[PDB]
Structure formats: C-alpha cells, structure tokens
C-alpha cells in the first residue's frame, strides 16, 4: 500500500473529516494514484473515466490526460447528519500529444508535435505524416486530430505497417500490436474535428510501428507511428 488515498467517513494514507476545509476536500490525484472513499453517498451516484461504485464505498482511477484544470468529479458524503464534499481532479500537466493535427482550426485545447493541414493536400491523394518515439521509458500521448473519417477505430484498432514485399496489411488491436497491458484511451471532439489518442507508460517489448488513416471529402492522409526499445 503506497498509492492509495483513503477517506474514512463510516463505521493507505487515511484522511478524515479534519483534512476537510469548510466541509470541502480538494484531492489532487497523481497519474499513478488511487482514491478509495468510505461513506454513504447522498444520491448513491457521483462524479459529475473509470469508477467503481460498490455498496457504501467508491474507487476512482486518475485519467492520464486532463483538458481543463477546472474539470473535476465531485462526490458528496453524508456522515452523522452532516454533508461533506470531495472534489477530485488530476494534477494539471499540459502534456503534449505526439501525433499529427490534420485540422486547420488553431484554437484547439490539444497540442500536437506534428501537423499536416489535410485541407491543403491534393484531392485523390494519400500523403503521409510520420511520428517517431525513441525513449527507454515512455509516458506520452499519441493521437491525431482528424476533421473527417478515421480508419480504423483509433487507437483501439490500428493499421499494420506497410509490407516491403507484396503482402497485405491488416487491422489489429493496439494491445496485441505493441504488446503491453493497461493502454489508456481517450476521445474528444471540437466541432467537426475528432481527437482520438492513446497513452503509453513504461518500456516496450519490441520496436513496432502502425498507421492510422484520416480522410476528408476527396482528400486523404495517414499518420505512421514508430516506437522503439531493446
């Protein structure tokens, strides 16, 4: 027990009704942290993500990416005829996204390492945007901002890399492709622009690559990712 915030309000760092300020509990959940609360929830539902509601107890996992420092999931407890509020939000770090922004709007909430305005490319074309990652350990966000259709469902499904010989490339599940476990996924939408990404923490068994396709009207593009280790 080293990454648990326990708040005891019923009958491993244990907080109680003393850490509250005016019956409020602002909780900064580190990316590698867990929060287990023990109380009787007012409406038995909460968190205006991955949460587990079990009897008079609740557990919440910190999301890898946070868009606005104000976004937060709020629980209200009722112990001994008293109301206590717990605000939970992850530590605000403006992580960059290692991918290609194909969209043209510049007032986005997300920052991409590479970018390629698909609106400018020729019709009936297929231009590539490559993104590479080369670290021993990873703690990065890889995604894209496509103003139109995205192929396949990225990044839960991905497109195999190109074959030198005349062999077909298929759609695979990212978990199998990069061969790691707790891959976190995240989606977003700014008007018509779709923002699909995935997180990656830890090392990697074998240097592998994949592709995700973005089409808009008669124009098309594709982002090729490559991550390495060992």
């Amino acid at each position: 027990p080293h990454n648990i915030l326990f708040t005891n309000l019923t009958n491993p760092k244990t907080y109680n009704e003393s850490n509250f300020v005016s019956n409020v509990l602002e909780v900064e959940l580190n990316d590698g942290e867990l929060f287990v609360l023990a109380c009787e929830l007012i409406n038995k539902k909460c968190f205006q993500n991955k949460i587990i509601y079990h009897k008079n107890l609740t557990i919440f996992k910190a999301p890898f990416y946070v868009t606005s420092k104000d976004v937060n999931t709020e629980c209200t407890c009722k112990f001994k005829n008293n109301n206590y509020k717990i605000v939970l939000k992850p530590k605000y770090e403006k992580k960059v996204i290692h991918g290609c922004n194909f969209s043209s709007n510049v007032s986005s909430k997300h920052t991409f390492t590479d970018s390629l305005d698909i609106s400018l490319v020729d019709d009936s074309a297929h231009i590539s945007c490559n993104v590479h990652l080369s670290e021993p350990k990873y703690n990065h966000l890889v995604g894209l901002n496509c103003p139109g259709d995205i192929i396949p469902d990225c990044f839960f499904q991905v497109y195999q890399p190109e074959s030198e010989e005349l062999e077909p490339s298929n759609i695979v599940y990212l978990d199998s492709q990069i061969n790691i476990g707790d891959i976190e996924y995240y989606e977003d939408a700014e008007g018509d622009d779709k923002i699909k990404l995935f997180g990656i923490v830890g090392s990697i068994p074998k240097t592998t690559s994949f592709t995700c396709i973005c089409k808009k009207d008669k124009k098309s593009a594709y982002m090729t990712v490559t991550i390495d280790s060992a």
Partner: antibody, heavy 122, light 113 residues
Framework: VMLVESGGDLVKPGGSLKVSCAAS????????MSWVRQTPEKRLEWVAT????????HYPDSVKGRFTISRDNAKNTLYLQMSSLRSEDTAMYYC????????????????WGQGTSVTVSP | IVMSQSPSSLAVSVGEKVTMSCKSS????????????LAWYQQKPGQSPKLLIY???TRESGVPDRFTGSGSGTDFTLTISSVKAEDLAVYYC?????????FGGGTKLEIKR
C-alpha cells in the same frame, strides 16, 4: 529556503501585471504556495492560494476574476497575473509557502519572501 | 471571520511582561481535533513577517520560549515573558479556519523611554 519574488512596477489603472516568485531550497511540488499583499497602511490581505500541482486555486471576492495565480513545478516558480488593477491593489506583495505538516488545503505560511512593490497609479 | 487586535500601540519596557489580544468573529475550534486554527506573526521593521505560533499554542521550530500564546473559541492572547530589545515589531493575528484567511490590525511595540 529561498523565496525571491520580482516583477513589481508602476502600472496604470485598468492595466495588468504578472509577478513571479522563485522557489529554492525545498521540494516545490510538495508544498502549496500563496500570495499575501501588504498595503502601505501595513495591512495584510490574502491574495491567492494554489495547490501543490496547480490544479486547485483560491481567490477572495476582492480579486476574483481579476487576478490569476499559476505555477511551473518544473521551473520551480510561482506566477501571479493581475488584470484590471485598481488603486487599492497598490500593495507590497509577498510570496509565502503554506504549511504542509498538516495535510490541509488551508493553513498558515512557513516562510515569506522579501517582497515586490506594486503601485497602481495613473 | 473578522480578526481584531487590541490595542493598536503598546508602549513596553525592556524585560517586562507583554500581552496582546486577538478577538475573533466566529469560533475557530474543530471539536474533534481540539485545535484552534489561528496563527501569530512578527513583522520586524524593514522586514517581511515571520511565523511564530500555529494551532493554539504550538510554536514553530526556532521560535523563542518566552513567546507563549494561548486562546480558545474567540479569545486569543499572545504573552511574552521577558521583552528583548530585538523582538520590538508589529505582531499580527491570522485565522485559517475557513476561506478566506483574515488578518489582524496589529499591535505595535514601542519602547518606554
């Protein structure tokens, strides 16, 4: 513990000004910081409080919507943007570090900076 | 939470006993914790303030023993056993019970020449 703030200048009323605070001699990411100004009448007013990881902020009604606190945990600095300044905001602003021994968002202040003077005048 | 500090000015003599009052507008006592959310500060002339006492009587590491503050509920007092010629400063009172933390008026210590 090294708390050195800078950036105080004569600002015209309505204008803005961001002052910074340089933290050194402690684990910045583990202690929450606050700004407290001292009027020329030697009155102490709390300005803003920020959480260790800059996710939660606190401002009194006086400067709510006008001032904006911020911090760069990597650069070990504390920033305070002050917009739509008024003659009353003419004070000596101090960069203070809240006590972390007691695990609570609101607490007293362990150490205090030297102080940077603000003069909102036209 | 309005913090008052009577009197405004305090003419003191080197070594004599000194007491400062701090009346609060509301209770500052979490019953279960039995701790008062008040703190005392010393602002040396031409210097930034410095924390002396927190909770009710819990002084900070490095604060002299002569500074003995005590209070409960809304009444709070800072007592000095023997006034040194060094600690002649403006002493402030602050609450940190609920937002926003409010300060006191301050009791200046003057020398009785």
């Amino acid at each position: 513990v090294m708390l050195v703030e800078s950036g105080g200048d004569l600002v015209k009323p309505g204008g803005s000004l961001k002052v910074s605070c340089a933290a050194s001699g402690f684990t910045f990411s583990n202690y929450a910081m606050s700004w407290v100004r001292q009027t020329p009448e030697k009155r102490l007013e709390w300005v803003a409080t920020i959480s260790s990881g800059a996710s939660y902020t606190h401002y009194p009604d006086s400067v709510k919507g006008r001032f904006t606190i911020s911090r760069d945990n990597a650069k070990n600095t504390l920033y305070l943007q002050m917009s739509s300044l008024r003659s009353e905001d003419t004070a000596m602003y101090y960069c203070g570090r809240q006590v972390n021994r007691h695990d609570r968002a609101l607490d007293a202040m362990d150490y205090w900076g030297q102080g940077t003077s603000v003069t909102v005048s036209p | 939470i309005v913090m008052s500090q009577s009197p405004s000015s305090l003419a003191v003599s080197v070594g004599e006993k000194v007491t400062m009052s701090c009346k609060s507008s509301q209770s500052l006592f979490y019953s279960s914790n039995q701790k008062n959310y008040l703190a005392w500060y010393q602002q040396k002339p031409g210097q930034s303030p410095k924390l002396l006492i927190y909770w009710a009587s819990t002084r900070e590491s490095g604060v002299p023993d002569r500074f003995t503050g005590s209070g409960s509920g809304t009444d709070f007092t800072l007592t000095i056993s023997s006034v040194k010629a060094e600690d002649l400063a403006v002493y402030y009172c602050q609450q940190y019970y609920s937002y926003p933390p409010t300060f006191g008026g301050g009791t200046k210590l003057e020398i009785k020449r």
